[PDB]
Design a protein around this nucleic acid. Structure first.
Ligand SMILES: [K+]
Ligand SMILES: [K+]
Ligand SMILES: [K+]
Ligand SMILES: [K+]
Ligand SMILES: [K+]
Ligand SMILES: [K+]
Ligand SMILES: [K+]
Ligand SMILES: [K+]
Ligand SMILES: [K+]
Ligand SMILES: [Mg+2]
Ligand SMILES: [Mg+2]
Length: 1336
RNA sequence: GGGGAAUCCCUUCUGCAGCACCGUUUUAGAGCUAGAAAUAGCAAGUUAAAAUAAGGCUAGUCCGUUAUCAACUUGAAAAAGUG
DNA sequence: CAATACCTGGTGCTGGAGATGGGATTCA
DNA sequence: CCAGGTATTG
């Protein structure tokens, strides 16, 4: 008894099928367990497991870190309160107790209800004097009087609780505060450098123009307009643009060749500036640094909108400015509306439901919604011009706690905190003693490279301590070992050398590593001149000369340089042909040139004695990111360099790690030669063996030493192994389920292993990434396309509009603008034609007026287009608006275009799967199935694991009319698996040589023809560019075994796809995750509310509702009834919530008695997870959605003829085929038009038996009878929509044409308590059926 | 002969750590006047405290939403076994 | 009870490693 | 976007 298995692995399904020799699906009697009269049942061996998607760990992580931030913010306040404790007890012995209980109702409070002062006169007086906290903050910063200790606490607490961001290193307000003074200094520096062309900046109000609440480019336009004889793209204009935050190009200013694009925000600017300064000199450094200072002031002027010489609290004064203008503007708005629109006043100022001032202050209206609600009312009235100005500046009626306070750096709050401490330490000695402690509470951050400050009970922690004692913000540097911690942060993430598993890999930018990479590439270079008979390798002396003369004097070494600067200069060759490198060398000595710039001592770099020192320096610069730690580590070399060099050295940092270890590169030596790997790369006689040859050469000891160094460690379990794969957790869920399905199928077949296993694996928020890409690209481009055409992220889900913005509103094959409103008239074209590369992503598509203008449709865009457009394409590449892959495919015609080999490769790629994840699944199945070794100790492959891509069965389905309609039911997953088994087994039966291509385990026109016609053996006649005919029966050529009988096997496939009994099993799952919805609801007289804290009665405090049920439980017990508490027997479903789950499981009887049940039959408790399956009357099935709702449980097996009619009539897929075959399909659609009514009838019978939605079914029948005159295509398309009424699972809304059908829900689970519960194995072939009516 | 390696250019995704700003919720910020009352007319509004999974023991400036799960038998569990 | 309409926490930033698909040079 | 919880309305 021989059989094969087909598998269809997806993110929400695993289809499976068992086939025999004749491509038939077996069927068996399977035993049924349980308490019903059915002892067995007949099952076909085909089906599909369905399951909810596996989730990433991201949401879990974001909640976990937020949790930590709330804990630490609370600890911050606790540190401050501990510092204040004793002196506060002398002033007000319960002040902190009133703060802690502020949330409680007066009934529950233990102290007086007024928090700050504990009496109403003083509390009212406080709020009258300080209407916002920022009033109190400003007062305490500016005033010189002794102040109440409770107000000092509230000010410091407010700063420490909401302390601002940490994006700026170092201290602030370093005389970079004033925009006027920094603009003056920029003009002074510029006029120093350009005495003949000076700028007249008198009368120019730089403060107002650059700090105006306007766009960067408009402020640039304003300032340049104030300077006659200067254009925005001149040098001074470009400096101002750089200060405002734009991305100016300094190339034309200094007549450069290298594009000097500079943005002060990019990480590369530090290098991008030195780069530019290398071409123009360092006299200009003082200029570009002057512009940088100006930017800081301009950034500060966005936050601090008040004169900094009238107060040391400009932030608080700016909030107070918000409050005063809010008050004045509210008074004016009230008066204006009173006078002009007196009837709207109540709606504006009393109705929280509307987006007026009432809904803005008390309702749910945001600042944006309120501005939208009141803009027409202001434009409608008179005297609202200044209010409209403030509204369009987003500066009308502002609150102080707003979404845009994310700009505020912590140094600002720190400045006010420090000033308050300096004022009041003169009156409170403990503030003087604790001033720096309090500052440290605000400033201290746990470094990202330290992680949680755990003590052995966190699986996320890596931090190590220097001493075992509690860590505080003040003892952190002494208790935490930051060095060891930062080292572990990297090392727990980096790979070891695979060749020497106990050796750490080198830093990617290490000098040794770059020598290795350069010599490895250079040793395989060959050259020819005239008098030479044969190309020659470079000798050791030639390679050393090329390294010293070229690689150690240029960052990049081109082939032109090799030819001219070496072969001409040294070897006296006028012509020489180079091979083994193209255009320029890929490897380079970048660190060598970095350090040469920093330390300026070539002889230090070239002296092998300093090799270790330079290796340790780069290691430090790679391993650590903190400049203080870097400085501490480099301190041991301080005596070798100057303090200037040491400062430049610590500012230089690298990231990234190599893939080989130092011990491998330059440690182990060949036993007889005594030479390391690097020694061989430098000089290897005339063989010039590279890395691969060296470690694979049996005459050297490298290979054997690698073999000895290997280890294996502890083996992963199957689950572990799958978890460590690279891929989406969703597809990893499908992989594990697939393995479990195969194990059960083998057990079904009497532990006999199959002959073949054929696997196919499906292909695999976003709008904000689209908007970010376009914003970055457009601002890098310097374009105003977002000025002229504002777009929202949702709109970018349109493919053409997204392409329009990515192309800067231009045609891509023609140098012309496109029109947004004409997008429907344009074409979206494939760069590499989709007949070769089935790529439909933006990486292979392009928006053009007319696809004709590409050239010839059979290849890459033509050479003429490439000559026209390569410059524009390069700008798109630099702005990252197209990728390197896209640019290379666009420009390929200048490299010969598509060769015949490229076309052969693309066709083969459409058939031979090469994704890494599918290889891993095949390796897993193959290593589980094949475990024995033969006489030569080689693996015995009893089971061939075959992998196919989806196109094979898809083309098979379309070519032989086995069409799929996904919406009809879930059978197509199973059918896909069946067709994979059939096609895959037949393919390797017919062409066993292709086993290397499709089976796991160890001329261009010819292969193009071959792989294009690989599947023709299925056809009876093939029309290929004339008509050839194949025999009825197809056999293998060598064995003579039959592989495909076209008279009998297609009938077998048809019968298999027509079987109505298919094992669709929805994986039952316990629900996990959040306890409930997160919304904190207002107080309500409802027992659905859940307390947010143990003592917060939700009727007084509000709280949550809508908990998630982890699983339901069948309880058979008694409950008290009536005022007499009489015991009445019950049987019901109790949903255990996720929050309740631990308590219920720790002791179920006590849990159930607490819920009210008595005398619980403990052994009749049935755990019922989501999607538990119940069967009622007439085959009607239901699934548990929760404890109080059910899902649909039945599948609608629509006969094959109706499915194929629906596919053809609806044009479900593209109308590909001969026009005569198109006509025959159209003729069949029209000859079988009565099928439409029959399909409705099939749906109707099904619903009346199983769905029971009388209102919906009647609305549907009326809708179908309403559009009987509609075209057949559209009626078929809408019949596809109808199947939502019958689909398995949760009910859902759908539309028949323009009629909307709302979902009919099953809001009661009472009936399943007397139905039959069905427990299903993973395949559903094994069942346990429990008649629940026999309980109770 | 290699779906194996290094390098260059990138693309995409997965794991983790550190931080900010809002939002919500209860309370505090004396509403006034005319009416016996429902109510009417007016005044006012911007701020704060505290919580932000209930909580846990291991008591850390730690942990608490990912992954994994038919039933049954033997099991404390892990597990293995059962058609 | 069964049916209907409404609800549903969100945004921004910093740092690091790996594997990954695929074009290119050299190899095993 | 799904789809289960919830209060309103009968
Ligand atoms: K009280
Ligand atoms: K000008
Ligand atoms: K609001
Ligand atoms: K190259
Ligand atoms: K680093
Ligand atoms: K020195
Ligand atoms: K789960
Ligand atoms: K889930
Ligand atoms: K199951
Ligand atoms: Mg907490
Ligand atoms: Mg708040």
């Amino acid at each position: 008894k021989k059989y094969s298995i087909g598998l269809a692995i997806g993110t929400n399904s695993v289809g499976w099928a068992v086939i025999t020799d004749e491509y038939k699906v077996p069927s068996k009697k399977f035993k049924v367990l349980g308490n019903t009269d059915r002892h067995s049942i007949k099952k076909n061996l085909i089906g599909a497991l369905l399951f909810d998607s596996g989730e990433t760990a991201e949401a879990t992580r974001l909640k976990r870190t937020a949790r930590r931030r709330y804990t630490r913010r609370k600890n911050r306040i606790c540190y401050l309160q501990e510092i204040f404790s004793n002196e506060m007890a002398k002033v007000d012995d319960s002040f902190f107790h009133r703060l802690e209980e502020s949330f409680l109702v007066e009934e529950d409070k233990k102290h007086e209800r007024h928090p700050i002062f504990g009496n109403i006169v003083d509390e009212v007086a406080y709020h009258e004097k300080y209407p916002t906290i920022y009033h109190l903050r400003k007062k305490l910063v500016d005033s010189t009087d002794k102040a109440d200790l409770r107000l000092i606490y509230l000010a410091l607490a407010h700063m420490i609780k909401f302390r601002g961001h940490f994006l700026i290193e170092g201290d602030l307000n370093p005389d970079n505060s004033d925009v006027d003074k920094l603009f003056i200094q920029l003009v002074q520096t510029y006029n120093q450098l350009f005495e003949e062309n000076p700028i007249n900046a008198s009368g120019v109000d730089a403060k107002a123009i650059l700090s105006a609440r306007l766009s960067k480019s408009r402020r640039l336009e304003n300032l340049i307009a104030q300077l006659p004889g200067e254009k925005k793209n001149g040098l001074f204009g470009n400096l101002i643009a750089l200060s405002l935050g734009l991305t100016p190009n300094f190339k034309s200013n200094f007549d450069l060749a290298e594009d000097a694009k500079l943005q002060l925000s990019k990480d590369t600017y530090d290098d991008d500036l030195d780069n530019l300064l290398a071409q123009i000199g360092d006299q200009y450094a003082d200029l570009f640094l002057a512009a940088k200072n100006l930017s800081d002031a301009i950034l500060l002027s966005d936050i601090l909108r008040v004169n900094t010489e009238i107060t040391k609290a400009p932030l608080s004064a700016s909030m107070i400015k918000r409050y005063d203008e809010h008050h004045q503007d509210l008074t004016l708005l009230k008066a204006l509306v009173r006078q002009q629109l007196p009837e709207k006043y109540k709606e504006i100022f009393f109705d929280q439901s509307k987006n007026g001032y009432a809904g803005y202050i008390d309702g749910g209206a945001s600042q944006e919604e309120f501005y939208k609600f009141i803009k027409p009312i202001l434009e409608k009235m008179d005297g609202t011009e200044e209010l409209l100005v403030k509204l369009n500046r987003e500066d009308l009626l502002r609150k102080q706690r707003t979404f845009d306070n994310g700009s505020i750096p912590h140094q600002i709050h720190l400045g006010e905190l420090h000033a308050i401490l300096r004022r009041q330490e003169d009156f409170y000695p403990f503030l003087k003693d604790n001033r720096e402690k309090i500052e440290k509470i605000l400033t201290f951050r746990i470094p990202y490279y330290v992680g949680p400050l755990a003590r052995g009970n966190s699986r996320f922690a890596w931090m190590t301590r220097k001493s075992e004692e509690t860590i505080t913000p003040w003892n952190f540097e002494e208790v935490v070992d930051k060095g060891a911690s930062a080292q572990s942060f990297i090392e727990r993430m980096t790979n070891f050398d695979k060749n020497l598993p106990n050796e750490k890999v080198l830093p990617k930018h290490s000098l040794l590593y770059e020598y290795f990479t350069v010599y490895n590439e250079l040793t395989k270079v060959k050259y020819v001149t005239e008098g030479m008979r044969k190309p020659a390798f470079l000798s050791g002396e030639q390679k050393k000369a090329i390294v010293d003369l070229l690689f150690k004097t240029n960052r990049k070494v081109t082939v032109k340089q090799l030819k001219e600067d070496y072969f001409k200069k040294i070897e006296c060759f006028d012509s020489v042909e180079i091979s083994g490198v193209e255009d320029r060398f890929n490897a380079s000595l970048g660190t060598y040139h970095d350090l040469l710039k920093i330390i300026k001592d070539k002889d230090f770099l070239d002296n092998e004695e300093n090799e270790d020192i330079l290796e340790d320096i780069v290691l430090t610069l790679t391993l650590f990111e903190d400049r203080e730690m870097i400085e501490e580590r480099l301190k041991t070399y301080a005596h070798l360099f100057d303090d200037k060099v040491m400062k430049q050295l610590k500012r230089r940092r690298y990231t990234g790690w190599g893939r080989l270890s130092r011990k491998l590169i330059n440690g182990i030596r060949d036993k007889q030669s005594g030479k390391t790997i690097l020694d061989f790369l430098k000089s290897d006689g005339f063989a010039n063996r590279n890395f691969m040859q060296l470690i694979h050469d049996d005459s050297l000891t490298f290979k054997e030493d690698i073999q000895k160094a290997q280890v294996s460690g502890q083996g992963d379990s199957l689950h572990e192994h799958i978890a460590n794969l690279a891929g989406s957790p969703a597809i990893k869920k499908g992989i594990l389920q697939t393995v479990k399905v195969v194990d059960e199928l083998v057990k079904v077949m009497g532990r006999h292993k199959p002959e073949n296993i054929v696997i196919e694996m499906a292909r695999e928020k976003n709008s904000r990434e689209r908007m970010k890409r376009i914003e970055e690209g457009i601002k890098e481009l310097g374009s105003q396309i977002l000025k002229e055409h504002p777009v929202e992220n949702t709109q970018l889900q349109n493919e053409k509009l997204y392409l329009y913005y990515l192309q800067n509103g231009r045609d891509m094959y023609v140098d012309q603008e496109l029109d947004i409103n004409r997008l429907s008239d344009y074409d979206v074209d494939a760069i590499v034609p989709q007949s070769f590369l089935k790529d439909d992503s933006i990486d292979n598509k392009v928006l053009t007026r007319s696809d004709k203008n590409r050239g010839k449709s059979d290849n890459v865009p033509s050479e003429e287009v490439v000559k026209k457009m390569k410059n524009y394409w390069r700008q798109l590449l630099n702005a990252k608006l197209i990728t390197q892959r896209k640019f290379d495919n666009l420009t390929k015609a200048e490299r010969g275009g598509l060769s015949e080999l490229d076309k052969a490769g693309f066709i083969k790629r459409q058939l031979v799967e090469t994704r890494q994840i599918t290889k891993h699944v095949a390796q897993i199945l193959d290593s589980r199935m094949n475990t024995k070794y033969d006489e030569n100790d080689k693996l015995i492959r009893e089971v061939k694991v075959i992998t196919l891509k989806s196109k094979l069965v898809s083309d098979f389905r379309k070519d032989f009319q086995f069409y799929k309609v996904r919406e009809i039911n879930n059978y197509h997953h199973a059918h896909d698996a069946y067709l994979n088994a059939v096609v895959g087994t037949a393919l390797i039966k017919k062409y066993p040589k292709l086993e290397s291509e499709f089976v796991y385990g160890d001329k261009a026109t010819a292969k193009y023809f071959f792989y294009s016609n690989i599947m023709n053996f299925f056809k009876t006649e093939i029309t290929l560019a004339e008509i050839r005919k194949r025999p009825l029966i197809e056999t293998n050529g060598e064995t003579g075994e039959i592989v495909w009988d076209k008279g009998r096997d297609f009938a077998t496939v048809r019968k298999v796809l027509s079987m109505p009994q298919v094992n669709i099993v929805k994986k039952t799952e316990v629900q996990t995750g959040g306890f409930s919805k997160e919304s904190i609801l207002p107080k309500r007289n409802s027992d659905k509310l859940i307390a947010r804290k143990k003592d917060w009665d939700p009727k007084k405090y509000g709280g949550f509702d809508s908990p998630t049920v982890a699983y339901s439980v069948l309880v058979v017990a008694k409950v008290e009834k009536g005022k007499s508490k009489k015991l009445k027997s019950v049987k019901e479903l109790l949903g255990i919530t996720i929050m309740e789950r631990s308590s219920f499981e720790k002791n179920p009887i006590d849990f159930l008695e607490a819920k009210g049940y008595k005398e619980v039959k403990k052994d009749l408790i049935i755990k019922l997870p989501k999607y538990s399956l119940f069967e009622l009357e007439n085959g009607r099935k239901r699934m548990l959605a929760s404890a109080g709702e059910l899902q649909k449980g039945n599948e609608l097996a629509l006969p094959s003829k109706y499915v194929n009619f629906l596919y053809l009539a609806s044009h479900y897929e593209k109308l590909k085929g001969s026009p005569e075959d198109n006509e025959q399909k159209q003729l069949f659609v029209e000859q079988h038009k009565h099928y439409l009514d029959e399909i409705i009838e099939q749906i109707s019978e099904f619903s009346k038996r199983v769905i029971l939605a009388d209102a919906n079914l009647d609305k549907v029948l009326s809708a179908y009878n309403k559009h009987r005159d509609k075209p057949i295509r559209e009626q078929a398309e809408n019949i596809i929509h109808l199947f939502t009424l019958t689909n398995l699972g949760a009910p859902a809304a759908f539309k028949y044409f323009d009629t909307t059908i709302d979902r009919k829900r099953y809001t009661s689970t009472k009936e399943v308590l007397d139905a039959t519960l069905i427990h299903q194995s993973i395949t559903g072939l094994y069942e346990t059926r429990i008649d629940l009516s026999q309980l109770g």
